[PDB]
Amino acid sequence: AFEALTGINGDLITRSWSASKQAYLTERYHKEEAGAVVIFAFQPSFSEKDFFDPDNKSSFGEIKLNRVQFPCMRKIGKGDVATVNEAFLKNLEAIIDPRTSFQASVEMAVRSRKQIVFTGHSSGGATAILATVWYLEKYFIRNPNVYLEPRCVTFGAPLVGDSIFSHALGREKWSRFFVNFVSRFDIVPRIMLARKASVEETLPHVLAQLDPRKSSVQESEQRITEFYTRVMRDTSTVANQAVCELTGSAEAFLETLSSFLELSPYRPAGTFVFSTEKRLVAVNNSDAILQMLFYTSQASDEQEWSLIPFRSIRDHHSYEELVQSMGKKLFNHLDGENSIESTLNDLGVSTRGRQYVQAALEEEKKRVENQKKIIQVIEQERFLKKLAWIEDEYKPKCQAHKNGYYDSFKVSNEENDFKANVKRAELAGVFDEVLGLMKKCQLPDEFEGDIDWIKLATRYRRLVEPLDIANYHRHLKNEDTGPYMKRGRPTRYIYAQRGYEHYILKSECGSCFWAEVEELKGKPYEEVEVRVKTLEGMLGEWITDGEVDDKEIFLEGSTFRKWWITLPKNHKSHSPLRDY
């Protein structure tokens, strides 16, 4: 049951636990070899320099990833790069440097076709998450195979990434590799949900209290109590604000308040396996995980308000007993069992917390329902025949007239042009409807990921975007709001182009040829030399890609050809496409 969902058996769990414990003594990582498995454990650093970087100025020690080193970790359409904790990131690129011999080890490990596992205790777990991301970005995305499928197993790790991080993980379908054990009271999962200033006072004492090696430090009542208190207050505010942002309701009142609040961006990423004295409870829903992080740790009654904080610290060192007593516990996947009220009380969840978790699950179900409805709409016969009528009827008949569809639309002397315009309007309407839902994200993370949503969008773009270019330059909208590329181009086409580019790569646009040739014509050659040259250089690449078709573009009546005639004798003589 457990292994079916998570993809790892108890043997690998125990071996990663032992390797993580071994990694304390080494420097920054320990390499263990068990037959076909190669486990890279990472050394936890319980110093407060290793949770909030000193040179970082933000209130959570977070930084945007470099888009070159972690390209796949971003929103493909919008273009926003993800946010990671800079302490752990600096740790990762410190270990990565060629002098450390980590990279040669992992590459000889992939040459030997071994199951690579990244693991670690509390902060070693965060370093393991980041190293798993780096590995997925450098090796798994180049030549994907099941022989390269990594695994990340963490025990009481803290949150590493923001919402865009978890989204990019869910989109590339990578969030299944990660497993993060969290006992019912461990505090290190919850720490980075609090502000730096909220815990900057009592952080050194508690981090010394959390280090397993040096038990020389002695417990202080008030430091632990106060640290746990604010950690829980910041957690409660972040959780309530995630509840209020569920459906987007009452957002404006929240917006007034949001201007008065700082909230942790970090969000759970991957599968989280809560553990008790009787049960294992796996969750995969980031928002449900976030609500459980607060409501599971709440006190059963006020008399226990004394016992809860101390146990917290103690429970950060219970993973030995956890792994040893793993088989005797009862397991049940929360997201899949349709009756969770008994499980939540068993976990330690009040009534209202149970309802908030229920609401997060219901919102996930509504997201998948919205995906179902969009799939039903885009597959119907009327939409497909609207897309087809432009390829089977408009473009061929406009090729017959030796002018082309883009010109035939521009001059617009037939009923065909009116029908083309109304069809283009309705197509743009449905694509704008779906675009907003994706921008809303009321859609599952895999949507931008799916190839079918990608083929449909790129076909629609290649067919219809020249029509819009013609509509823009036909009614002199150019002379009103500027060049098309800057302010005229719709968002849907940019989303589609970026989705296609990301999918295939893992005047710059293809279907924007007409846009360029518009600004090119009518100017002296001495100033459009370089632009004309770049266009005709890429022209062949689009023709190889398919975006542009020579049939249409090279007809006698076509605007681009009649313009290219006007060019300088020397240019047309030495032009690459002279033979056309």
């Binding site: 404006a252 009654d301 308000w305 908030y356």
Partner: protein, 509 residues
Amino acid sequence: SSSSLKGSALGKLVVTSGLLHSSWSKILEIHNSGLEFQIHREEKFTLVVFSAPPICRSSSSDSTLLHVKDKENPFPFLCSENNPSFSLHTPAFNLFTSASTSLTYLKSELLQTLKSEKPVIITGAALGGSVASLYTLWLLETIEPTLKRPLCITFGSPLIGDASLQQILENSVRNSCFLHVVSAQTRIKMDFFKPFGTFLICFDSGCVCIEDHVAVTELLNGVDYSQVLNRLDQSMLSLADSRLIPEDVIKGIEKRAEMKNLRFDMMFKKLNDMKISMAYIEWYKKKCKEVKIGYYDRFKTQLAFPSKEFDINIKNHHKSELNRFWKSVVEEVERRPQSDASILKRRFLFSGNNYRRMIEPLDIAEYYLEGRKEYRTTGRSHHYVMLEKWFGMESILIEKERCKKRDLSDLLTFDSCFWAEVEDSLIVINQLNTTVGMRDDVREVLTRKLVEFEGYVWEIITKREVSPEIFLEESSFMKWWKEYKKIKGFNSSYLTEFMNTRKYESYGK
């Protein structure tokens, strides 16, 4: 259900943020027969506290009506067409006007503070909360999503407004700047006065944050707030909270919220077929240009004598729905800004600009066929000038070029009131030719009008800004030119020779 969850979560959130405790601490500070107010400038925000004498019980029912044209009303900007008048609470408004003097400079300073991107809070006690609300409203006369706006926080205040003020701010962006805290045992007879802004009802089990005013009505219809704040803090550490407010109220809130969200996305749906209606209008304009009449004068003719049913459909089905839709758009957006960066993010603004420049001539024809006068200053409806101004505001930020050697056969004229001016000049020529016994000074001032309009025609022509479809034979413009040529005698102007050198058909090429 989702709505009760959002309410209780927002309540706990606002309690945990800590604003309530700081504001009540400052109120206690100022606490221990006129309005007294203090300021508290801090590092995180600026705070203001008002305070008023004990509430006069019977003297609190009376109200004082206001009007848009009245200049005793300090709020001319919030009232609008459908709501030009709104009454207010009498003692609250009295104490606000009484103290307007120094809080004028205070308003200048607080506006500067908000310009500095620093938060601002106003707060109030039992009766001074009403005055704080009035001051916040006076502060919110220029609201943009990007600009920082204040926030009012009130404890135990009675109502200040009637149904009309509640209707002015029912869904506006200003209702998002008020927060009242009422003990669930407080009962307010709301027969005449109506509440507004977000409410926070405090039980002993916990608080609940309401936004729908109907729910607030049914809850409050029909006390030391330090005690209930302490009970809130205690309930923050109480294991169980039960259903405080009845479930039928939740039913109502959920129903109204769903209705509002579907009503909102309906217009995003509708714009797509509005574009198709405008495509039909484009076809109609093309056909009217074929017969050398122009769709303006053809539309006028058919509006006088309906003969073609195609034009009957154009007028009754396309234009009416375009007008209704865009009126609804402008009426809804100016109370709830879109996208933050601009009203009508980008599709609505540009589509509305094209809608205006294409459809306002038809409304001008309908206006001047009815026999009215002076359209530009008296005729055009609100949404037209709103669209024009909102496009002008962003038309300067964008970089554009207007080539000289282009076809203008489909150029829509930017000054959409061109035909109104043409018809006004036609009317003054009709006067100068037909009326008898008229004075001479009036004759020369009408010649002033005529030469002014001639220059206006010439400035728009030489600027390459007018559609050549005005030079059609059956057009109203060429008829007006024939009249003005008859009555001009032999005065000579570049436009007059321009009309005589027969270069007007070479125009637009």
